[PDB]
Chain A
Amino acid sequence: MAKFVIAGKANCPYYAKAELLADYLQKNLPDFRIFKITQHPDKWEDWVEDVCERNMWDHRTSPIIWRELLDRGGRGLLLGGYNEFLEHAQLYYGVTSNMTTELMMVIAKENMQTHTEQQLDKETMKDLISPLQVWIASAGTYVCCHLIPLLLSGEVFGMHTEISLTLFDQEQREDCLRSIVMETQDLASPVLRTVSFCTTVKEAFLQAQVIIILDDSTEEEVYSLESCLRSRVPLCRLYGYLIEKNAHKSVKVIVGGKNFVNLKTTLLMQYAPNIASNIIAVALGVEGQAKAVLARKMKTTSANIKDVIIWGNITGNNYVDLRKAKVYNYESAVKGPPGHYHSVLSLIFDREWITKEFVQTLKILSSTGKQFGGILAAHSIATTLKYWYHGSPPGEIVSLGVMSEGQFDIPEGIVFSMPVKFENGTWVVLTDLEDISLSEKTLSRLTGDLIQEKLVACG
């Protein structure tokens, strides 16, 4: 096994004739191997000068010819332009090229056309492209690792999506996000085609089609709540402006995290009014926690529990409504066939536990956020996106954080958590649900908290 390379200019006569000789040799000789290179003549000078410098050869005319000692792209041993290779082949093999000069002219045209083909092929590859564009803000965060595998599952969209993903934080976070990108590549998902980092202002959200917004790890010290709220405002303003300018007009923006989620969403919408309708806050995790608490009390599975509703600040003061909550597969001897359901309030004989204890427990869970881990956050975000594209389960209520336009009573211009279904790529608010009215005291408490947060943030 001998190994050779020749580089060409698309017009070079002698390079073409070399190609003829090479193909003759490789066809007839068992021993012979060659790789083929050519550059546009303008590039050729630079490309060859670089090669020659690396080798410390001294050759300039096209073609250039060298034997590579072990493998393709090793070190080379230099043979001279065409006459020297022809000499080598004639003496060592005994072979002769027989091609005419006129033929060399024609093939010089043919190879010009071949390079034109190569160029068009490059352009052709650009045509083939129809990815989905995704972005993630505050990506340098532990939740992000759990989220990415759910995205890669493709179930979010169906296993038929060219996915392009983007991740943002500052350069120090960019180091760990580099590691995240490495793991992402290793995850070797069938729908993954690209992933990217961003750190820099102009780039962000550029033609973004999906945007994920996480909590920030505020590296700043423990400022007062008022300072924390205000500190969000510059970041929300920047993100809103960047999204509105850079993103695709139909971009979807999802806000998730443990803190001030409603406020962040509201500010973003304020700065990004047009997209604001597209922007939603994930409540599902709180609902899941409530379901699990109920299931533990009942000694059943959470999946049997359905139609829990979260009424409030997701990451703050919220009310959990069980009036519509249903349980399935329970062992009431008043026992239906599969798919029968009984009302949680009816089953739980301890109203005191519901009123005092359950509420206090949820208040603790929300305030601490302790049990809100990476798995739950990821599950909530992923499942919300899944319902947004696919739709929610028929008949089942979902909770979502969304901007009030007065719907029940709720004052306009705040983001509230409320019961919703997902259909046709879009959500609807279940304003036709009976009895789910709130008390005036409850509503006043819930809205007042959000309003005060908003006011303090605006300062």
Chain B
Amino acid sequence: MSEPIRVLVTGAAGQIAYSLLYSIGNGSVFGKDQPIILVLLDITPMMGVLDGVLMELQDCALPLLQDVIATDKEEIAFKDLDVAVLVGSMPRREGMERKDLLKANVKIFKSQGTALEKYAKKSVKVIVVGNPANTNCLTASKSAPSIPKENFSCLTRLDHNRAKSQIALKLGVTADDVKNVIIWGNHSSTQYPDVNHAKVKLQGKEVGVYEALKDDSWLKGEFITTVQQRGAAVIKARKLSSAMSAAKAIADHIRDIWFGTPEGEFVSMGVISDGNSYGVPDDLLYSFPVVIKNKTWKFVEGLPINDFSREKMDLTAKELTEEKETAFEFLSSA
């Protein structure tokens, strides 16, 4: 048997984590022959909830699960990790200023990054989910300089999947028919969904979404607006967060990291802008279209950028830059 891996989930009492854990344990992430050790970290009050979760997991009798560890201690939780999924973050409260939200998250992710640096394996893979995902991920990475920055990624797969869903709905097709969608930039309302290089399978033939839909107007205006606002719509209707789809997206993201992307297909990921050929500033966490082999990602080069795309990309890069500046003021003062 393959040696068990240690996987950490932070904020494990939160609904996204709760949804995710079963997908983690059942082999959908790491495959049906990888034993897992699962590590759950939360604040002390949640431990009661966390204990209830641990029990329910043990009740699921998942064959690939050979431990569940619940702790409020970073030194325990971050010990010898193989994979860390950072879902826990402070949610923005009413009347909380954006700067205070940033400071609080910077504190949390600085602490977690230092714990990774000290306790975790240097090969650890780190996935950041808690908003603001890009800036939090950057803060963590700066706090874990010994770990290769490529190990650190933030969840943009949710936007990619949403975009694919919207395209498939418009064409009337499965999600599988759609390929090579791109999300550029921040996981925020400023995120840019790009289908200029996306392909779809229609009438047994593969065709490019611009050609297939032939509605550039609707692709620019309505598709983008729908994707950007999809989460707010879901919360407005349910009165509850998008836990199910977030969990799905996280699972997909990790699974593509672990297996790699299919040949001739690329995926969108939030990743450190250093060395991009697209002229995004270095030292940013930006979202790019990427191919993954041997648990290593690479950037899909040579894609032409029209001025519409370029403008969106620079707008979101500006947003990310401002966020970075604000967070780094606290990181240096902290």
Contact = CB atoms under 8 A, between A and B. Distances in A.
Is A in direct contact with B (CB under 8 Å) within the complex?
Answer: yes
A120 interface: no
Contacts of A305: 61
A264 to B, nearest CB: 23
A179 B169 contact: no
A189 B174 CA distance: 8
A1 B248 CA distance: 41
Contacts of A180: 238
Interface stretch (A11-19, A100-108, A345-353, A372-380): A372-380
Interface size grouping (class) on chain B: 35 or more
Given A71-B216, A303-B61, A188 B234 contact: no
A182 B238 CA distance: 10
Interface stretch (A43-51, A269-277, A294-302, A440-448): A294-302
A303 B220 contact: no
Interface in B153-175: 158, 161-162, 164-165, 168-169, 174-175
B121 interface: no
Contacts of A148: 244
B62 A303 contact: yes
Nearest to B163: A188
Contact of B56 (A185, A192, A296, A371): A371
B162 A186 contact: yes
Nearest to A159: B176
Contact of B18 (A175, A179, A375): A375
B217 A302 contact: no
Contact of A146 (B19, B174, B238): B19
Interface string B230-246: 10011001111011110
Interface string B204-233: 000000000011111010000000001001
A109 to B, nearest CB: 25
Contacts of B245: 183, 186-187
Interface in A172-212: 175-176, 178-180, 182-183, 185-193
Contacts of A302: 58-61
Interface stretch (A231-239, A285-293, A319-327, A407-415): A285-293
A182 B234 contact: yes
A290 B248 CA distance: 29
A67 B35 CA distance: 62
Nearest to B18: A375
Interface in A78-125: none
B52 interface: yes
Nearest to A287: B61
Interface string B125-166: 000000000000000000000000000000000100110110
Given A176-B237, A182-B237, A187 B248 contact: yes
Contact of A183 (B21, B55, B216, B244): B244
Interface in B183-220: 214-218, 220
Contacts of A296: 58
A38 to B, nearest CB: 15
Contact of A301 (B65, B165, B220, B237): B65
Given A145-B243, A146-B19, A188-B164, A376 B60 contact: yes
A72 interface: yes
A193 B233 contact: no
A70 B220 CA distance: 11
Contacts of A288: 59-61
A143 B60 CA distance: 15
A193 B174 contact: yes
A190 B176 contact: yes
B66 A301 contact: yes
B175 A192 contact: yes
B60 A183 contact: no
Contacts of B57: 375
B63 interface: yes
Contacts of A291: 59, 61
B247 interface: yes
B253 to A, nearest CB: 13
Q: Which of A35, A70, A187, A188 has its CB near the most chain B CB atoms (within 10 A)?
A: A188
B175 A149 contact: no
Contacts of A373: 52, 56
Contacts of B21: 375
Contacts of B233: 182
Contacts of B216: 71-72
A176 B23 contact: no
Contacts of B240: 179
B330 interface: no
A371 B55 contact: yes
B23 A149 contact: yes
B60 A375 contact: yes
Contacts of B328: none
A395 interface: no
A190 B239 CA distance: 28
13 contacts: A72-B215, A148-B244, A182-B234, A186-B161, A186-B248, A189-B175, A292-B55, A292-B59, A301-B65, A303-B61, A303-B63, A375-B22, A378-B22
Given A149-B19, A301-B61, 11 more contacts: A149-B244, A178-B237, A179-B234, A179-B238, A183-B234, A183-B242, A187-B244, A189-B175, A192-B175, A291-B61, A373-B52
Counting from the closest, the 8 A-B pairs by CB-CB distance are A71-B217, A179-B237, A188-B175, A190-B176, A302-B61, A179-B238, A71-B216, A303-B63
